[PDB]
Write a protein that binds this ligand. Structure first.
Ligand SMILES: COc1cc(F)c(-c2nc3c(NCC4CCNCC4)c(Cl)cnc3[nH]2)cc1OC
Length: 265
């Protein structure tokens, strides 16, 4: 897990920031080949935050989740991850307006496969948004950004916080309780983003106005040209009651079946 700084070259290419610090493109010399990487660079609590994120990524092994190469202790603490060259899903759809519905379905279905694995592993993501979905290719999506992620206690199906509010389920906002079903709500917001060509959800609204909207039983309207089946699935992800809301196994299956209806014209 510990990487050699002399084997890492940081490119003059920024992929993200904050916070925290910056994300830079880089190249890491492996045992024989160089690997293209994304390097999360820290610039006291922020150190433990990065190490807990590294500890979460170390435990995960699925084709639809970004792979961590390792950690690097140098000028700054660094988290070295495999590069997804096409970048975030929202930015991609904003700039590539001719992506077919079949293709958007294929991508969000891959996200649902990665989340089904996270659900089975009893980890909660807590930052599941289109900006955190990375494209390896136009037909291959991966879940990234485990900065808010938690390993659930063995005796509880939720993490209690002691925030990307527009992606959060009511139980998160009201009770600070985060479960895999809370990630399903976020997934519904992500699907809305993907079918709105990366438009931000709840445009022009304050967090408190979003809470009020949701509590009155209101939800974002159907994106122009969105398949009805996909909008219906978003509304099922947006079930107020955690108990009636589907888990990722049920979501993955519905997306998979709908994908085959679309693939076969
Ligand atoms: C065309 O514009 C982009 C192309 C890119 F390839 C990338 C990129 N960023 C990462 C990345 N980390 C940072 C992103 C985590 C999710 N939230 C967004 C920033 C990691 Cl871990 C692995 N591959 C990545 N590819 C970013 C881009 O625009 C921000």
């Amino acid at each position: 897990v510990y990487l050699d700084r002399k084997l890492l070259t940081l490119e003059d290419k920024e992929l993200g920031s904050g916070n925290f610090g910056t994300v830079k493109k880089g190249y890491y010399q492996m045992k024989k080949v160089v690997k293209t990487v994304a390097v999360k660079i820290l610039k006291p609590a922020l150190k433990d935050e990065l190490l807990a994120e590294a500890n979460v990524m170390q435990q995960l092994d699925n084709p639809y989740i970004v792979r961590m190469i390792g950690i690097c202790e140098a000028e700054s603490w660094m988290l070295v991850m495999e590069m997804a060259e096409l970048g975030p899903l929202n930015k991609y759809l904003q700039q590539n307006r001719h992506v077919k519905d079949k293709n958007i379905i294929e991508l969000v279905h891959q996200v649902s496969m990665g989340m089904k694995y996270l659900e089975e592993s009893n980890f909660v993501h807590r930052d599941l948004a289109a900006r955190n979905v990375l494209l390896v290719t136009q037909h291959y999506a991966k879940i990234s950004d485990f900065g808010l992620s938690k390993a659930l206690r063995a005796d509880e199906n939720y993490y209690k916080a002691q925030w990307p509010v527009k992606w959060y389920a009511p139980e998160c906002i009201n009770y600070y309780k985060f479960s895999s079903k809370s990630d399903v709500w976020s997934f519904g917001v992500l699907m809305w983003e993907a079918f709105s060509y990366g438009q931000k959800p709840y445009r022009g609204m304050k967090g408190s106005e979003v809470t009020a909207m949701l509590e009155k039983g209101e939800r974002m309207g159907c994106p122009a040209g969105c398949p009805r089946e996909m909008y219906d699935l978003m509304n099922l992800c947006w079930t107020y009651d955690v108990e009636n809301r589907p888990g990722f196994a049920a979501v993955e299956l519905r997306l998979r079946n709908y994908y085959y209806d679309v693939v076969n014209h």
